[PDB]
Scaffold this active site. Structure first.
Site, PDB file in Angstrom:
ATOM      1  N   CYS A 179      20.523 -36.745  14.194  1.00  0.00           N
ATOM      2  CA  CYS A 179      20.597 -38.233  14.061  1.00  0.00           C
ATOM      3  C   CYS A 179      22.037 -38.741  14.246  1.00  0.00           C
ATOM      4  O   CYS A 179      22.292 -39.739  14.891  1.00  0.00           O
ATOM      5  CB  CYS A 179      19.950 -38.751  12.763  1.00  0.00           C
ATOM      6  SG  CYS A 179      20.589 -38.093  11.199  1.00  0.00           S
ATOM      7  N   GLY A 200      28.341 -30.848  12.581  1.00  0.00           N
ATOM      8  CA  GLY A 200      28.262 -30.348  13.953  1.00  0.00           C
ATOM      9  C   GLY A 200      28.226 -31.445  14.995  1.00  0.00           C
ATOM     10  O   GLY A 200      28.195 -31.202  16.198  1.00  0.00           O
ATOM     11  N   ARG A 234      27.850 -28.086  -0.188  1.00  0.00           N
ATOM     12  CA  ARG A 234      26.430 -28.489  -0.061  1.00  0.00           C
ATOM     13  C   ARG A 234      25.597 -27.905  -1.192  1.00  0.00           C
ATOM     14  O   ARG A 234      24.556 -28.427  -1.559  1.00  0.00           O
ATOM     15  CB  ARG A 234      25.832 -28.040   1.263  1.00  0.00           C
ATOM     16  CG  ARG A 234      26.144 -28.977   2.426  1.00  0.00           C
ATOM     17  CD  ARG A 234      26.375 -28.161   3.694  1.00  0.00           C
ATOM     18  NE  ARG A 234      26.769 -28.961   4.843  1.00  0.00           N
ATOM     19  CZ  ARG A 234      26.149 -28.958   6.019  1.00  0.00           C
ATOM     20  NH1 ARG A 234      25.089 -28.188   6.219  1.00  0.00           N
ATOM     21  NH2 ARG A 234      26.591 -29.727   7.008  1.00  0.00           N
ATOM     22  N   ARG A 238      28.702 -36.689   2.206  1.00  0.00           N
ATOM     23  CA  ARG A 238      27.345 -36.971   1.698  1.00  0.00           C
ATOM     24  C   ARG A 238      27.484 -37.825   0.470  1.00  0.00           C
ATOM     25  O   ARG A 238      28.264 -37.500  -0.418  1.00  0.00           O
ATOM     26  CB  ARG A 238      26.566 -35.700   1.366  1.00  0.00           C
ATOM     27  CG  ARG A 238      25.900 -35.034   2.562  1.00  0.00           C
ATOM     28  CD  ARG A 238      25.140 -33.781   2.133  1.00  0.00           C
ATOM     29  NE  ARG A 238      25.266 -32.714   3.127  1.00  0.00           N
ATOM     30  CZ  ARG A 238      24.253 -32.062   3.703  1.00  0.00           C
ATOM     31  NH1 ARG A 238      22.994 -32.329   3.386  1.00  0.00           N
ATOM     32  NH2 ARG A 238      24.509 -31.125   4.612  1.00  0.00           N
ATOM     33  N   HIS A 295      26.826 -39.765   5.093  1.00  0.00           N
ATOM     34  CA  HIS A 295      25.420 -39.308   5.142  1.00  0.00           C
ATOM     35  C   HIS A 295      24.697 -39.633   3.912  1.00  0.00           C
ATOM     36  O   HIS A 295      25.084 -39.231   2.829  1.00  0.00           O
ATOM     37  CB  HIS A 295      25.338 -37.792   5.268  1.00  0.00           C
ATOM     38  CG  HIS A 295      25.411 -37.299   6.679  1.00  0.00           C
ATOM     39  ND1 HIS A 295      24.537 -37.691   7.621  1.00  0.00           N
ATOM     40  CD2 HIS A 295      26.300 -36.421   7.297  1.00  0.00           C
ATOM     41  CE1 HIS A 295      24.842 -37.081   8.789  1.00  0.00           C
ATOM     42  NE2 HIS A 295      25.927 -36.309   8.589  1.00  0.00           N
TER      43      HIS A 295
END
Lengths: 319, 322, 318, 323
Positions: free
Chosen positions: D151, D197, D183, D219, D178
């Site tokens: 996306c 990426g 993570r 995030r 995001h």
């Protein structure tokens, strides 16, 4: 000292681990799916409880903590784990994937005398909620032992007190938690089932069919609560109920149950080690019989300390 | 067409407006807010919760336009000086929340307004009206300053009525779980226990029930939908199906569009933007010992409520003629 | 000397909590709209930083056996500073950030006003670890501590300037009309003054840096995301070493270099103005640098207030 | 007329489906998920982020009716084992996340399907398409397993494409905020920085830009809208007005429906259920030194992408016929 092993390193695995590294026994192994580097980090830095009060050092095939060595195993099959090999008397099972005895018995196959489940068991020898039914632990009868769930651990001690003092006619409950469970947690209150009232059949059998409940999942990080509306058999006041709990906390249930007179919010109970923290200011009484009691509990901190309490006890009964 | 105005433009005022402009039985004319024209326009148009406004807006020095219509704007902190008699407005929807005391809200009256409606539990008010319940106790001649109570009361009063009428009520304890003292603390990361007035407010709309219902609240950090979770003892034997059926019938009936019965496994967000005062969660109904009963009632604490406000406002409008 | 906090919002609360563990000065009074029983509590129990002795009384408090007087007033001119012998006032309501307003304090008998926000026509702005030596007790009465963001950016942006020199920058601050909207669901894009403000603590950097804010739903820790083009060739190691040095060096306690991989909540209850995220530093074609600095938007900034307050008190004392 | 099948029913498959079923150019005739019909039904029906399904859905034993169209249900974890052949199924949208290798993806072909489309970036796939950017480099005769990237890449690439065509790019850095090692950690409290990426990926779709851009992710806990924060140096002199016009122009133009230009003071939630790849937040464009440019682009990181998937699926379909 007696060698113990933790199997899996999810949230419960980690917290249990953390407060376990205590005198009565010693953690000599972890079987996990994460590489030394990663475990290392997880132990030291905590999303919810802060930072590690101890020390940590990473290695290839093992770990060091406070100079205490810990071997790191990666096997998804317990059959092939080296307990007897490693001197491991008791296995603390935190993976949550072997919760059924038939599947948990493999730790005993592999040289371990006892398995303690950090979740509710299937066909387990016994379920012990510390502070309530622990006398029921028979060491020579029982091999796979359940600690129940964190909600049960909050509920059982509370419900026990009421029933001893005032008698319990019946009751309904709601666990506000931090199918429909599929859904996004962040934007919603999610209703659902709870098994924690059904679990009482296991640790408090006289109370069978007397209590039912449900859960509301809400988007809060750590501390949950039990909201319990019960009817009693004899006249009570807000005062009489709160003093039952005041009594018992200085008493028989010291460290299991806390009484909070003070006006706090769910996050004030972060890192509290009791199973149930009665919120004294929310006790209500209607018609001299109907009783509401709110009990806070940390989802992991309290539970995990009851896991170490239980492990301590089993270790004590092997000796 | 009766001419009406909205005092204050908080979430309520905004949300009332949104569906009020869209009611024909009366026409909206003016407004009073601390917000500049460009601002108010935006506020109408974009909403974080209920989404984009269905319609079209435009902005000017002293006035607006919405979906073809002219709306006047004022910034007058003070009700008396409010220019009511002039714009010729009968009824003032008071949504600021600063004027909920009779006296305070009587200024609108003095300033040329006839009847004035509080979008919050009023004090020393002529009358409190929960729709679906006591809307019948409203006598236009007797009452000027009128309250629609609190959105929690609007969820609880209908449920408690259906149970009382059908099975009779003995006792009850309710916990309210509120989407956003102890209230001073930051609620974003917390479950905040607090008081609720919804059980004592019943004394105003359901007086035969005094002292039977008490309760408390839990504020959680969720965006919109709230719930009332009620535990009552009733006066005769019931079951899950019996209770649940009582709510189904009434939602097809006399409580139509006030109360709804949902049979599905939904979660709180799914009732977003729902117009019912009470939405019964059917899978959640429980019965212990034949008497003790748990019921769950969802409500959107902006949308459902602010629909009853239109509702209440249009009754007054349908009286006052007659 | 004797110091008063005007305002007891989140900011005033953290300052106060920090001050009490300081000898340099003692907070004798708080003006604020809360009841003492409440004030006690807000202090005693912290939402984000954990927990605190205390006790309450009608018109005054006892914190660690020490007498804090409690006023409730909205006009400063009518507060009893002189009566109370308060030399310095910490203005934490941020209703009075304009000066012609901040002075009412001076007329009520207070010597010095310290704004925990950016000023308007303030006598001076001070970011501790950058321009504090520019403080003149003679000329400067109303003194601005700037914003928590300016206190992150400015110590980072100068270290970069002195060591490599700066050419250009754009920045984003990620904060825990558009402002009105619910912060709970959304990322809210908005303005920042923190870049504009350097023009008052680092004037040589004028119009070399612009910025914006992203307001996100998280409880405490914020970050600055800076992309600068520097005047000479650098490397990730080169940049990260400048910070490590400065953190053991002149900027010790103001700035810190974090090598480990951490998330925002790890920086809770950290007193530093900027915490450099050493694993995030990037370099593009030798001249284009990305630096990420965390800051506790309350704790750090607060401690910088007690540092400024401390300075001013000493300065008066001489 | 061309029978298509979705493999996997997660956020993406579901969102793709929701959009696909409403498309004329082609046909969703089957869904392979691990879920019993009653739940699939409920999952299509009620969406937490995007709200309630616009339409009607009925669950049956082995199939569904969606807008009165019969959708066959399958539950087989084995692509080889699926009857793509008998169902007349030419293209398979692959959304499970498990078959992203070409080693694995090809099965759907061994099982009788012409083409597979991965709703993620591909590992050793034949090609990666970003609609609006490299579309025409699709070659039906040589490309079997096609990737639609991520996306983010889908946000970055049209934007970066635009800036380069008009002003040339020297250098870029970026941050993706995001929604939804590091993570690892608990997400509800914190801003979690991590890798992305999205910048390498440009190597597959806009190769000439290779090496010029790098990025990172941040995030944050929000429901569904994401952004790309882009600080780039251009080759020639620009103003805020110049940049914003390049996007205004493109949005009425070559990228109509891919790229939006927002002039209004909006917040992230206003872009929910927006179909564009990137929405330029025009009030955030900056230029410093006549060269350094900051652009912010919103994207709905489900709904926009999902739509691209359908655009890409549509595109494949239109070739097979072109044969």
């Amino acid at each position: 000292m007696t060698r113990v092993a933790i199997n899996g390193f999810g949230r419960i695995g980690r917290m249990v681990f953390r407060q376990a590294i205590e005198s009565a026994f010693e953690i000599v192994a972890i079987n996990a799916s994460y590489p030394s580097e990663t475990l290392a980090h997880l132990i030291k830095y905590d999303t919810v409880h802060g930072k590690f009060d101890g020390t940590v050092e990473a290695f290839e095939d093992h770990l060091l903590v406070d100079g205490k060595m810990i071997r790191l195993l990666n096997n998804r099959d317990p059959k092939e784990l080296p307990w007897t090999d490693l001197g491991v008397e008791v296995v603390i099972e935190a993976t949550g994937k072997f919760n059924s005895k038939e599947k948990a018995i493999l730790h005993v196959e592999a040289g371990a005398k006892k398995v303690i489940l950090t979740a509710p068991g299937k066909n387990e020898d016994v379920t012990i909620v510390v502070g309530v039914n622990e006398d029921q632990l028979d060491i020579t009868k029982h091999t796979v032992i359940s600690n129940a769930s964190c909600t049960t651990n909050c509920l059982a001690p509370v419900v026990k007190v009421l029933d001893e003092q005032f008698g319990i006619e019946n009751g309904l409950m709601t666990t506000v938690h931090a199918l429909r469970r599929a859904r996004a947690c962040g934007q919603s209150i999610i209703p659902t089932t709870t098994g924690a009232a059904k679990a009482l059949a296991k640790v408090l059998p006289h109370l069978n069919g007397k209590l039912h409940g449900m859960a509301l999942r809400v988007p809060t990080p750590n501390v949950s609560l039990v909201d319990l509306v019960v009817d009693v058999k004899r006249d009570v006041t807000v005062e009489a109920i709160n003093d039952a709990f005041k009594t018992v906390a200085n008493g028989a249930l010291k460290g299991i149950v806390e009484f909070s007179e003070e006006p706090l919010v769910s996050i004030d109970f972060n890192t509290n080690t009791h199973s149930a923290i009665i919120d004294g200011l929310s006790t209500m009484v209607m018609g001299d019989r109907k009783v509401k009691v709110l009990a806070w509990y940390d989802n992991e901190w309290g539970y995990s300390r009851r896991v170490v309490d239980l492990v301590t006890l089993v270790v004590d009964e092997l000796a």
